[PDB]
Design a protein around this ligand. Structure first.
Ligand SMILES: CC(C)=CCC/C(C)=C/CC/C(C)=C/CC/C=C(\C)CC/C=C(\C)CC[C@@H]1OC1(C)C
Ligand SMILES: [Cl-]
Ligand SMILES: [Cl-]
Ligand SMILES: [Cl-]
Ligand SMILES: [Cl-]
Ligand SMILES: [Cl-]
Ligand SMILES: [Cl-]
Length: 274
């Protein structure tokens, strides 16, 4: 029993009806408060009515404090726009948007020396909202509900520089934000090209992850391209990641969609310590 629309148990259906009744005062100000929306919060707290309501009400306050309704129109500062890696590229075989994270070339120190933690976190919030918006568009296009995302997490080049304490702490703040505000949004996360340092790095961030997220993390081995193509059509995957997708100009990295980071020029630095 999956706890999804169309599949609910009698106890889950009853809990959903009570939940909607209990939180109806905040629904008008939420985006599309359909059963699918409500059930994300209920599944995240195992249909505990008190905990689910507390989680949703905290999210309502987050949306207000961070101006989430208007965040898609907020373009990050130059250093972040140019050097914060990652991007949305393609859809998986079930129609879910795919997000690429590119860790190796990420200059975490340069970013923290060039941008406020608040603007870095706001940029990550905006990414979440962009992905949810793409899910809504896919839902309309496909005529069935699309509400999760697939992540390709490229750990090639992961190194000790990424485990600088302020970077780990800032990333943990992002992860907590994700868990508290975007529950039940991750479908699967594929870690590719992980080096030997990966288990230590993973242990540093596990404290910030939910058990639900941990269950969805799949660490791939040498045959990672093959595995990706079992989940995503080749025409939806960059050549760089085993597919046939390119930028319009032929570039196999699909850089028009995916930012590949890089070391941040000193002209962007705004502080000398963090
Ligand atoms: C993200 C923010 C707030 C600022 C950007 C600059 C910055 C602080 C970068 C942090 C660098 C850093 C600590 C990268 C983390 C490396 C940790 C790993 C490779 C372990 C694996 C991490 C996983 C599986 C978490 C994935 C989370 O579920 C996700 C939301 C994708
Ligand atoms: Cl520039
Ligand atoms: Cl210290
Ligand atoms: Cl260990
Ligand atoms: Cl563990
Ligand atoms: Cl599988
Ligand atoms: Cl420079």
């Amino acid at each position: 029993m999956s706890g999804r629309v169309g599949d609910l148990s009698p106890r889950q259906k009853e809990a959903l009806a009570k939940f909607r009744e209990n939180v109806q005062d905040v629904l008008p100000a939420l985006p599309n408060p359909d059963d699918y929306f409500l059930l994300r919060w209920l599944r995240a707290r195992s249909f505990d009515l008190q905990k689910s309501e507390a989680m949703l009400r905290k999210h309502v306050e987050f949306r207000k404090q961070k101006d989430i309704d208007n965040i898609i129109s907020w373009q990050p500062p130059e250093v972040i726009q140019q050097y914060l890696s990652g991007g949305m590229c393609g859809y998986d075989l079930d129609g879910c948007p795919v997000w690429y994270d590119i860790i190796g070339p990420l200059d975490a120190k340069g970013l923290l020396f060039s941008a406020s933690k608040q603007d870095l976190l706001r940029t990550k919030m905006r990414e979440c909202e962009l992905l949810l918006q793409e899910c809504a568009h896919q839902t309309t296009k496909l005529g069935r509900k699309v509400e999760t995302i697939t992540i390709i997490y490229d750990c090639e080049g992961l190194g000790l520089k990424h485990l600088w304490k302020p970077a780990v702490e800032a990333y943990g703040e992002f992860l907590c934000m994700f868990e508290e505000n975007y529950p039940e949004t991750l479908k699967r996360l594929f870690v590719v090209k992980a080096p030997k340092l990966f288990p230590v790095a993973y242990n540093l961030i596990k404290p910030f992850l939910s058990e639900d997220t941990r269950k969805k993390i799949m660490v791939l081995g040498a045959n990672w391209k093959e595995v990706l193509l079992k989940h995503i059509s080749p025409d939806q995957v960059p050549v760089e990641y085993g597919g046939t997708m390119t930028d319009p100009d032929g570039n196999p990295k699909c850089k028009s969609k995916i930012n590949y980071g890089g070391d941040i020029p000193r002209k962007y630095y705004v502080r000398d310590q963090v």
